[PDB]
Design a protein around this ligand. Structure first.
Ligand SMILES: CCCCCCCCCCCCCCCCCC(=O)OC[C@H](COP(=O)([O-])OCC(O)COP(=O)([O-])OC[C@@H](COC(=O)CCCCCCCCCCCCCCCCC)OC(=O)CCCCCCCCCCCCCCCCC)OC(=O)CCCCCCCCCCCCCCCCC
Ligand SMILES: CCCCCCCCCCCCCCCCC[C@@H](O)O[C@H](CO[C@H](O)CCCCCCCCCCCCCCC)COP(=O)(O)OCC[N+](C)(C)C
Ligand SMILES: CCCCCCCC/C=C\CCCCCCCC(=O)OC[C@H](COP(=O)(O)OCCN)OC(=O)CCCCCCC/C=C\CCCCCCCC
Ligand SMILES: CCCCCCCC/C=C\CCCCCCCC(=O)OC[C@H](COP(=O)(O)OCCN)OC(=O)CCCCCCC/C=C\CCCCCCCC
Ligand SMILES: CCCCCCCC/C=C\CCCCCCCC(=O)O[C@H](COC(=O)CCCCCCC/C=C/CCCCCCCC)COP(=O)(O)OCCN
Ligand code: SF4
Ligand code: SF4
Ligand code: SF4
Lengths: 176, 70, 303, 210, 156, 96, 99
């Protein structure tokens, strides 16, 4: 089924013609648009008082990356390299070797945050929930170099944001 | 809300207040406390000049009333 | 004390045009469901000061090949004319009282286009010159109808003296006597100052902006005096000053409202608007206003 | 976006118009050949970046057709719902930027408030405001959170008045009419021959919709 | 003495003026321009910070590069940068402008806008939310507040 | 009516601890609203809410005047909110 | 004299303020690094000039109304306006107002 948007026929009786002429001469639709804008002036603005007020977010929000660790205090990452295999932008570089106790742990874990596209594929490929994409979005930088994260930076990010990262994972993990 | 526009407008208003009133006050100060005499048409200019000559102080606004008729 | 009067006329107008920029931003913001500047200053009140300081501190981009003479002359002429227009106006008593005040204002408006012409010619660019030519054509075109409308209105005043317009309207505004001419005058003042829907076009740039906004405020003051006659009591002129200023503010906010409300015309569209809708009706209403005082034996006094 | 345009003018009339494009050619199609299908899904978000989930849906439909599988019914309903939301987003953007370029510029803000609300809907479902990467070649990535449908209904029952305000500003305004009426007329045969589709067809009277 | 006090105060005044009215131009090359426009929307309202919307290149204070910079585009970017008055800053928005991002290994993409122009602030994201870009603008304002031009001239 | 909004303005002045606190919040946060205090932060931040405001404006934070090592009377930024209050403030939860 | 002083003050203030605007940013150190001839524009300029001349003819109308020859003055004023309208109509019908 279809509709006509512009298939109207103006009436040609004297009253309609006079209405059209009065609209042309007295600018009725122009005044009506003025009235619309005037009415819109007298209603509350939608502006929020940043940085004292924040825009709403979700537990599913993707932000600055982090490397998590188990409650015992040991890091979750086991160098399976699935996050590096799935990364659409090839932003992750990983190097691993057996630790001093035979544990399978990384020695290099770099994310180029200028290559990242913040798709979250890395956190949904990880089987141990090690790499997450946390809630932080205010991490703008004055140099290009500070956006090339290494393992220490990501581990510090995890230890910094662990409380809210774990709370968000608790809120959202049943949807995965 | 919209009334936060009112402060700035007020300042604008205050500025537009200053010229007009100022002129009026100056016209009162330089014409002996009365309206500045406007002189088109050159007849009332003649009246102003006659007043200036009559006053004796070379000021047209110094009026000489009936007490000067003796 | 005449120098004090000149300064007390000049400085407040510059301050008012400085704060009009702030007011415009605030009004369009609130008409657009947001806020204007409200961070710099208690309610954005220090925004104009910061703007002025930044503009006067920033590097100016001299064309490095242009005629430096006209390049500097154009802002001087624009700002001087914008300030000179305020001399004739009676609020209630004018700084300078002239017999032909209205004709003087018309002459200054007529000169106002040389700034556009010289800036366009001195830019050393074909496209900027073409834009200046279009602007000048629009300006002269609408100033034609300004002159005709203005004399048609003054046919009920008896002279070109601006002060007499206060005496003419002690009992009723001139908006009621001739509203079609008032509508046409308002539109032509839109098109004169290059305001929406007719705006097709560091230091010296701020000079031009100052001159244009002063021209807008003066156009509104002229319109308020010409069509919205305030009551004047000789023993308390500040009442007249307050009424006149309030009406001028309302008309300026009406420009801002119109800017926020509308699309903009094409060049040929506005030229056709003038030459084929405003000029014929302006001529017809000029004939009507020539005839009307004679038919009704209501010819104004002064001759 | 960014466009270069070379035109021959005789007076004010346009005699010849020649657009030069390629200022945003990144080479998406060649880069896709080095990624898997899942890895190549996010490029389609960036292709037409005002209607993201529509591109996602087209890519997913192609991959599903080649895979000989079909998504579950609820996934299809979610896909169509978010496709219509994306259509609302795109039409708001198009109309209000058209008006902005003409010079109206107020409905731009009026309706980008609604656009921000729809971005919040995108964010709640996928964690991303615009490049959701929500619609995959097997269905959708995640299920709706338990309060999403209520908020979608609450948003959608006031939007008609926003469209009405836009129409009040634009539809009957004589300046808008004279800017738009009898401009860029295209005949049905020329529209078909030139490869036009979408509204460009229906504006000329052709009854077609996929 | 008072010589350093006066220059410090005057520098503070000039810094406050310069950072309290930032007039940007935006190369809306790609989809980061959409979030840039959402920062001008009612909710975030960059104008309320003194940051006007779409200033001309001739009177623009900061350049915001929001989108992918291709090889076909870099000369125009540099030319527009060269025609800005001196107190000028560049803000890089999103992955594509920061370091190439999702098109980093492409024959027709410049691997970062900083290969062409010096950049003051990097805003990371794909795209950075309008709030993130606002945070970047305010960070640039704080950076301007930190600078000190009159003291350096005094001591030289 | 209009007297009612004026009395609300005066109550809004008085609820900030006098004219001094009123001007402090006016010149620091560009907003002088009064809401119920939700919590105190170990770095000095204060958290307030007001459910009668529309979504987005119904929660806010007053930043401390001195965080780790710098004077933060004017130089405030959104990275100063700790992760738990970050989650509450950005409306990812209803539980402070 | 008063008007001369007012003009001198206005021009002097404009000159000095433009000069300070143009020299304040030049005290600090920085890097320091056609043919078409549209005929329609000329035609509209000439049309403006001619209508301006006829407006100059119409300008003494406010004083023309006190003459005791009200019929003659009315006839001449309406005649001038008729010729203004006739010029406009002629230029309209000969495609002189097109773009
Ligand atoms: C008019 C004169 C000023 C009063 C005024 O504008 O009231 C408008 C007020 C409009 O209501 P509204 O602002 O839509 O309602 C929002 C609540 O009042 C919201 O109430 P609130 O809690 O936001 O109130 C804050 C309060 C305090 O606000 C302030 O102190 C900051 C503004 C100071 C401005 C100086 O604002 C005022 O009550 C003062 C009004 C502005 C006076 C100037 O009511 C009227 O005066 C209507 C008058 C008729 C208009 C035609
Ligand atoms: C009268 C003679 C005129 C001559 C030419 C001068 C032009 C007029 C001078 C008047 C300018 C007004 C200055 C007022 C600035 C104060 C603004 C104040 O609010 O700034 C605060 C503090 O800012 C600075 O610390 C103060 C610097 C102000 C100037 C310092 C001394 C200047 C005096 C020099 C005068 C001598 C003039 C000689 C040259 C002709 C905090 O603002 P800020 O942090 O930004 O923004 C953060 C926003 N938050 C709070 C929401 C997060
Ligand atoms: C620039 C404008 C120049 C003329 C401005 C003054 C016009 C005017 O009407 O004032 C005339 C005024 C009062 O006359 P009325 O109002 O009719 O009333 C008299 C009865 N009391 O009388 C005088 O002008 C006296 C002084 C005249 C000498 C100066 C006249 C102006 C000459 C301008 C020279 C500057 C030109 C330099 C180049 C200009 C390039 C744009
Ligand atoms: C609405 C009202 C608005 C009022 C209109 C504007 C008012 C103007 C007020 C002027 C404020 C003072 C401006 C001073 C700052 C000028 C810019 C600046 O800081 O430049 C620093 C510049 C950098 O030089 P270098 O480091 O050696 O070279 C670097 C290049 N390789 O240093 C200077 O040259 C200093 C210039 C002298 C300033 C000394 C006194 C301060 C100014 C006094 C007031 C000026 C007007 C009187
Ligand atoms: C018994 C004796 C009676 C004597 C006779 C008097 C009777 C008069 C009756 C009729 C007079 C009406 C004339 C009024 C002027 C009409 C001019 C006009 O029609 O122009 C419009 C165009 O006008 C505009 O659109 C201008 C819009 C510009 C934006 C302004 C928005 C309008 C609202 C602003 C408010 C106006 C404020 C005016 C009061 C200000 C007071 C100082 C026509 O354009 P088109 O529709 O395209 O027609 C062309 C093809 N025929
Ligand atoms: S972060 Fe997870 S997916 Fe990546 S290497 Fe470590 S364990 Fe594997
Ligand atoms: S979010 Fe996407 S692009 Fe970024 S590191 Fe993870 S997989 Fe790679
Ligand atoms: S930086 Fe990211 S969001 Fe912006 S255009 Fe490129 S891919 Fe899209």
């Amino acid at each position: 089924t279809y509709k006509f948007v512009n298939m109207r026929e103006p009436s040609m009786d004297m009253k309609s013609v006079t209405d059209r002429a009065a609209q042309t001469l007295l600018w009725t639709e122009l005044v009506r648009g003025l009235g619309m804008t005037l009415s819109y002036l007298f209603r509350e603005p939608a502006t929020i008082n940043y940085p004292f007020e924040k825009g709403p977010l979700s537990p599913r929000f993707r932000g600055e990356h982090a490397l998590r660790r188990y409650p015992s205090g040991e890091e979750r990452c086991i160098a399976c390299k699935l996050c590096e295999a799935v990364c659409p932008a090839q932003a992750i570089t990983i190097e691993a070797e057996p630790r001093a106790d035979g544990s399978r742990r990384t020695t290099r874990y770099d994310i180029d945050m200028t290559k990242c596209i913040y798709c979250g594929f890395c956190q949904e490929a990880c089987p141990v929930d090690a790499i997450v994409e946390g809630p932080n979005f205010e991490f703008s930088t004055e140099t290009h170099e500070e956006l090339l994260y290494n393992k220490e930076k990501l581990l510090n990010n995890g230890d910094k944001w662990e409380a809210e990262i774990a709370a968000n994972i608790q809120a959202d993990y049943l949807y995965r | 809300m919209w009334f936060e526009i009112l402060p700035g407008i007020a300042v604008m208003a205050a500025c537009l207040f200053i010229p007009g009133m100022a002129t009026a006050h100056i016209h009162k100060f330089t014409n002996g406390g009365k309206e500045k005499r406007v002189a088109h048409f050159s007849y009332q200019w003649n009246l102003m000049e006659r007043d200036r000559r009559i006053s004796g102080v070379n000021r047209y606004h110094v009026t000489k009333g009936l007490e000067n008729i003796d | 004390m005449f120098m004090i009067n000149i300064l007390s006329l000049i400085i407040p107008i510059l301050l008012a045009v400085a704060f009009l920029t702030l007011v415009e931003r605030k009004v369009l913001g609130y008409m657009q469901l947001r806020k204007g500047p409200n961070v710099v200053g208690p309610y954005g009140l220090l925004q104009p000061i910061a703007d002025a300081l930044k503009l006067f501190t920033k590097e100016p981009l001299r064309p490095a090949t242009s005629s430096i003479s006209m390049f500097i002359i154009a802002p001087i002429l624009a700002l001087s004319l914008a300030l000179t227009m305020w001399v004739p106006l009676p609020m209630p008593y004018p700084l300078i009282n002239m017999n032909l005040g209205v004709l003087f204002m018309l002459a200054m408006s007529s000169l106002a286009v040389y700034s556009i012409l010289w800036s366009g010619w001195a830019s050393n660019s074909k496209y900027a010159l073409i834009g200046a030519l279009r602007a000048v054509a629009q300006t002269i075109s609408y100033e034609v109808t300004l002159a005709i409308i203005l004399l048609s209105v003054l046919l009920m005043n008896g002279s070109y003296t601006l002060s007499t317009l206060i005496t003419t309207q002690e009992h009723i505004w001139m908006i009621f006597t001739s509203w079609p001419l008032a509508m046409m005058w308002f539109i032509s003042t839109l098109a004169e100052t290059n305001r929406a829907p007719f705006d097709l076009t560091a230091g010296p740039f701020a000079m031009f902006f100052m001159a244009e906004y002063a021209n807008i405020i003066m156009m509104n003051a002229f319109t308020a005096i010409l069509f919205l006659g305030a009551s004047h009591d000789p023993h308390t002129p500040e009442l007249y000053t307050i009424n006149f200023v309030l009406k001028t503010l309302a008309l300026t906010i009406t420009f801002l409202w119109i800017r926020a409300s509308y699309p903009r015309f094409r060049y040929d569209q506005l030229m056709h608007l003038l030459w084929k809708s405003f000029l014929p009706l302006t001529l017809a209403l000029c004939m009507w206003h020539i005839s009307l005082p004679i038919m009704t034996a209501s010819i104004p006094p002064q001759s | 976006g960014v466009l270069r345009l070379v035109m021959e003018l005789s007076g004010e009339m346009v005699r010849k118009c020649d657009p030069h494009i390629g200022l945003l050619h990144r080479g998406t199609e060649k880069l896709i050949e080095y990624k898997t299908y899942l890895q190549a899904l996010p490029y389609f978000d960036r292709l037409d970046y005002v209607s993201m989930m529509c591109n996602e849906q087209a890519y997913s439909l192609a991959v599903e057709k080649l895979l000989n599988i079909q998504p579950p019914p609820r996934a299809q309903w979610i896909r169509v719902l978010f496709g219509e939301i994306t259509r609302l987003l795109n039409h708001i953007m198009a109309v209000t930027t058209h008006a902005l370029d003409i010079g109206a510029m107020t409905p731009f803000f009026w309706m980008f408030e609604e656009r921000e609300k729809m971005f919040e809907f995108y964010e709640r479902v996928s964690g991303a405001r615009m490049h959701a990467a929500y619609i995959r070649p097997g269905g959708v990535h995640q299920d709706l959170p338990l309060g999403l449908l209520d908020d979608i209904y609450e948003f959608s029952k006031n939007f008609s008045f926003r469209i009405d305000e836009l129409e009040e500003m634009l539809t009957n305004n004589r300046i808008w009419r004279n800017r738009t009426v009898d401009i860029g007329v295209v005949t049905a045969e020329d529209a078909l021959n030139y490869g036009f589709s979408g509204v460009m067809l229906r504006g000329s009277g052709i009854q077609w919709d996929l | 003495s008072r010589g350093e006090y006066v220059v410090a105060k005057l520098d503070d005044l000039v810094n406050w003026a310069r950072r309290s009215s930032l007039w940007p131009m935006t190369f809306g090359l790609a989809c980061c321009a959409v979030e840039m426009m959402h920062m001008a929307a009612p909710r975030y309202d960059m104008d309320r910070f003194g940051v006007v919307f779409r200033a001309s290149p001739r009177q623009s204070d900061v350049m915001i590069v929001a989108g992918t910079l291709t090889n076909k585009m870099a000369p125009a970017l540099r030319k527009v940068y060269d025609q800005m008055p001196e107190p000028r800053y560049v803000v890089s928005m999103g992955s594509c402008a920061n370091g190439g991002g999702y098109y980093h290994y492409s024959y027709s993409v410049v691997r970062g806008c900083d290969r062409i122009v010096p950049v003051d602030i990097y805003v990371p994201g794909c795209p950075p939310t309008a709030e993130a870009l606002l945070y970047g603008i305010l960070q640039l304002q704080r950076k301007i507040k930190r600078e000190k031009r009159l003291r350096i001239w005094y001591r030289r | 009516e209009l007297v009612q909004v004026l009395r609300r303005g005066l109550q809004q002045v008085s609820g900030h601890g006098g004219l001094r606190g009123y001007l402090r919040v006016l010149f620091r946060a560009n907003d002088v609203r009064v809401g119920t205090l939700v919590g105190e932060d170990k770095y000095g931040n204060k958290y307030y809410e007001d459910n009668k405001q529309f979504f987005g404006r119904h929660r806010w934070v007053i930043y401390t005047t001195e965080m780790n090592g710098r004077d933060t009377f004017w130089d405030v930024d959104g990275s100063m909110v700790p992760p738990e209050w970050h989650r509450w403030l950005h409306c990812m939860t209803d539980d402070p | 004299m008063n008007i001369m002083l007012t003009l001198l003050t206005n021009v002097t203030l404009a000159s000095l303020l433009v000069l300070i605007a143009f020299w304040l940013p030049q005290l600090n150190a920085y890097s320091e690094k056609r043919l078409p001839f549209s005929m329609k524009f000329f035609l509209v300029a000439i049309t403006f000039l001619l209508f301006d001349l006829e407006i100059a003819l119409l300008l003494p109308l406010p004083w023309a109304s006190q003459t005791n020859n009200l019929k003659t003055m009315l006839t001449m004023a309406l005649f001038l306006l008729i010729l203004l309208a006739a010029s406009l109509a002629y230029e309209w019908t000969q495609k002189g107002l097109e773009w």
